[PDB]
Design a protein around this ligand. Structure first.
Ligand SMILES: O=[N+]([O-])c1ccc2nn[nH]c2c1
Ligand SMILES: O=[N+]([O-])c1ccc2nn[nH]c2c1
Ligand SMILES: O=[N+]([O-])c1ccc2nn[nH]c2c1
Ligand code: NA
Lengths: 265, 266, 265
């Protein structure tokens, strides 16, 4: 219980509530700190969104090259890619890439539309045995992160196990598994979070999330050199420290976890 | 037509709108009084909620032993089992048992979340050919029972038929069928309603519902001695009599239906 | 295209926004004018609603002869058939017939209940590869047609493609496709729109839509003599002319599309 104690101290310093799940596929060994408590997902849901879209592509019900057009009026805030393509539109794949690697919010709304809504995202998760995660609203309202509101939440343990199933299970075809991995590995938004505490020679894919009420999140798949991948889901909400210090909490969680795994071997 | 006249009179004495459906599987014989009209389900939907969960267990997408945790602030009113387990949580199976046999409302929400919400329960019902019943809202709001509002409603006939399909058709595995039976037979909230009016030697499973606007419901599977099961769905809403008197209306429906089915055979 | 320019002028006279898609199954030829912009469906979605009901009949999950009863409080405006059957109810088939050929609004709400609501119609569309069209609301609210609101919209191109798939593809059984076709051919509400501008010896089925903000729509399947069918989806919204002039805009679209198709040869 040393990791547990250090995480509790860290949580105390943050002023908020911190959830952590680790899933090591070399052994099946897990670790949880509030792993079975609900947390607002904010943009971490977008990893699941892209999986759902890829599943439809595997089914022949969707095409990565299909072009979606939209208006200036459709933009919501934090849309650094989609705001550049009002004139020419974007393909389903480009929206996926933008939603994951730049956390583009309009991209995610267009892609929820492609599924038919947040309820369809939730059905896809239920179809793969994640009985926990739920999406309820669109961008930007799904980031309100109100305490005690179960909408648009997951648990760290549920997210970790679902990310595992998606990337290593047979939910997605091999080509779609690789595509999702490649998008996560190319994430541009996460350099001050889990990536920052991880050893530099770890190969990392991640998706961040950020919201109201001091919410800062990050989920990742990590390949240490010559080892099976490890899944790490970290959620922080109700934090009373500023945005930089919240990023550092997440970076510190990776440091703490890595050091804990080191003392297993 | 004598049973229909009797039920018209009892309806007048309830001061509300009464709905009855009977489905005898010995013969397929049916009877309805307003069997075609919508009524607020209130907790009777939980029988269907448990069925949806079990079907996902059948499918390997859900596990009855899967533990679910929650906090004090997730509790809603009428949660006598879930309020005792804020600390250690409950399994899928324990929640379905609390939802059925104690009508626990928070257990029902947690289970709705396990399906993905009211719309997922509705979709389950559409997937077994129930094109009538609909769940729109969560607990406690789905009990508002406002006249003319179709949300969260069924008809007596559709609920009797869906209950028959669930317990005796091939929607559920045989193990899951028996589990749903066992839960309804184990119900603790229905002693003043249909059970009260049925002959003591009948073996009975039921699920009650109770809501605003004087809404008082009960659905049952009933095995008379050496006889095939009969399904009985009874809905009472907009009633102007007090709660013990509404319960007695339901008990009287069971007495009248039993007496009329006797007159069938003899 | 001269046709694109002719439609631009017609659009400008209308003061609103005009969308046109043509899909010719004899040749594969396609034409679009704003074919990829979203437009409020209003009652044109009822052609999709019926198809989704017929799908379930085909699946053994629904019955055309099933009777639905309802009370007088359940009626919404524009229910010329259902208001005559509060006493005795209507069958599913009757309700589809009323929703398509008289654009009965209560009939559409009862059938939407039969599916389980707007999201279940959206899920039907997604299941056949229409990743665009969406239903969100019930009658009468789905007709508000606010500019910029993507609820209850399609695109002219998506709707022409979906209609083609429903009426000619393998989604519906031979009997259900013929039944949908017969209902469209029996439409009573479209005499001043596309039908009015098509040559009199064309065999036509159609579904109209009308809404707030100057919205007037008509989608149609057309069989010219001795020819495979042509799908024609025409949406007009934000128009600044009165209801009769908007109908005449739709008639003129048909005339212009016919003339353009003649001058291909
Ligand atoms: O992601 N991780 O939970 C994790 C665990 C152990 C490690 N060792 N090196 N990188 C690691 C990452
Ligand atoms: O549940 N029943 O409607 C029902 C009908 C006839 C009966 N006879 N004995 N028990 C009976 C129950
Ligand atoms: O519906 N049409 O787009 C259409 C196009 C060309 C035609 N020529 N004859 N009828 C026609 C209908
Ligand atoms: Na009526």
């Amino acid at each position: 219980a040393a990791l547990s104690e250090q995480l509790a101290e860290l949580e105390k310093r943050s002023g908020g509530r911190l959830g952590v799940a680790v899933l090591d596929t070399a052994t099946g060994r897990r670790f949880g700190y509030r792993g079975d408590e609900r947390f607002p997902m904010c943009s971490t849901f977008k990893a699941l969104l892209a999986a759902a879209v890829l599943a439809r592509v595997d089914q022949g019900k969707e095409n990565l090259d299909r072009r979606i057009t939209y208006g200036k009026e459709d933009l919501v805030d934090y849309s650094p890619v989609t705001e550049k393509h009002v004139g020419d539109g974007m393909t389903v794949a480009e929206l996926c890439e933008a939603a994951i690697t730049y956390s583009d919010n309009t991209a995610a709304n267009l892609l929820l539309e492609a599924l038919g809504g947040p309820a369809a995202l939730t059905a896809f998760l239920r179809s793969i045995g994640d009985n926990v995660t739920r999406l309820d609203r669109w961008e930007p309202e799904l980031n309100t992160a109100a305490p005690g509101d179960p909408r648009d939440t997951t648990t760290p343990a549920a997210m970790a196990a679902t990310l595992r199933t998606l990337l290593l299970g047979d939910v997605l075809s091999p080509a779609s598994r690789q595509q999702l991995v490649d998008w996560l590995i190319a994430n541009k938004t996460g350099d001050k979070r889990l990536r920052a505490g991880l050893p530099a020679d770890d190969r990392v894919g991640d998706k961040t999330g950020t919201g109201e009420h001091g919410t800062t999140n990050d989920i990742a798949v990590v390949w240490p050199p010559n080892r099976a991948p490890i899944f790490l889901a970290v959620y922080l909400t109700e934090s009373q420290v500023d945005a930089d210090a919240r990023d550092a909490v997440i970076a510190e969680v990776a440091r703490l976890v890595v050091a804990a795994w080191l003392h297993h071997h």
